[PDB]
Amino acid sequence: IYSSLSDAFNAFQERRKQFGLSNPGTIETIAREVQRDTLLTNYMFSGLRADVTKAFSLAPLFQVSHQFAMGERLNPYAFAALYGTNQIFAQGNLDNEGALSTRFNYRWGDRTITKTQFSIGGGQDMAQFEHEHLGDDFSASLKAINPSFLDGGLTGIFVGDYLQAVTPRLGLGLQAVWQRQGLTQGPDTAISYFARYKAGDWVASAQLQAQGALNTSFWKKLTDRVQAGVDMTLSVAPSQSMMGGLTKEGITTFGAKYDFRMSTFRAQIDSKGKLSCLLEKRLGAAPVTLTFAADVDHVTQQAKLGMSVSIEASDVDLQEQQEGAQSLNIPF
């Protein structure tokens, strides 16, 4: 009986060669093929802050830093550090400016890749659990946010995603968002449709959240040092016919990477009225790096500027770590 399932599996494995190369199935990192380059850059667009980080690696397994945030986060001393072993990564973010907040990340497995990302704050505590379910050409992941329980019941966000290649270059996935907003509140759910078109000339991608709207993106490299991408976001929501809040809207952005040895550069067009630039430079004389950010509003012709400095302490362990850095099996 069950052997026929392994036989159907073998039929899949025979056809697998024809199906093409294996997908890790993570939609968020596929979305990051563009958003690694643009949303992380957008995480870097706040120019209302100076951002200094003072890294002290202790050992290859240990990395200590000090964050000096300003402006929007306003945490000029936010200690942070990360640690780990092969397939183990932990991160600890702490900040103390009247309000207390800290975040801790952890990785629990190799064959059963699982991780946790939880935090506390004065204004909101957050717990994020993720359980990966890696397939042969696909994967699923159980994600949960603030998964509190009731005596005889449960609350919280329990997202279940699945993605599988349908073609050697193209693929499909779903993001089953499920969340319980309360005992009296429902089990809100929505499934995002996800599609990917990973052409080697450009990756197209699209996300249709069932409660949301189709987001699309394109990514290609121009050179081995210059990379570029385009994306579109969409939102639609109905409102009061008498001058209501109709949200039908969309944003298209363009941008590119111009990276150089010891330097990184981002530039993007957010709108006809909005553009951003990010420049980073590593000092060749020392393991420190400088970053400058610009956001220019041409609706009001204003420019938001900011700066970040990150340093790594140099010590004899740094060279010993270069000597001991024989493996990258630590996740990040």
Parse the chain into domains and list their residue ranges. Answer: 8-332
Distance (Å, whole) CA 24 – CA 29: 10
Distance (Å, whole) CA 230 – CA 11: 39
Cβ neighbours of residue 19 under 8 Å, at least 6 residues apart? Answer: 12, 137, 165, 167, 168
How many angstroms from the chain centroid is the CA of residue 89? 16
Query: What is the number of other CB atoms lying within 10 angstroms of the CB of residue 152?
Result: 6
Distance (Å, whole) CA 257 – CA 280: 11
Query: What is the number of other CB atoms lying within 10 angstroms of the CB of residue 270?
Result: 19
Distance (Å, whole) CA 159 – CA 194: 14
Distance (Å, whole) CA 307 – CA 284: 19
Q: In this structure, are residues 188 and 180 in contact, taking their beta carbons and an 8 Å threshold?
A: yes
What is the secondary structure of 144-176 as a DSSP string? EES--EETTEE-EEEEEEEEEESSSSEEEEEEE
Task: Tell me the β-bridge partners of 286.
Answer: none
Q: What is the resolution of this structure in A?
A: 6.8
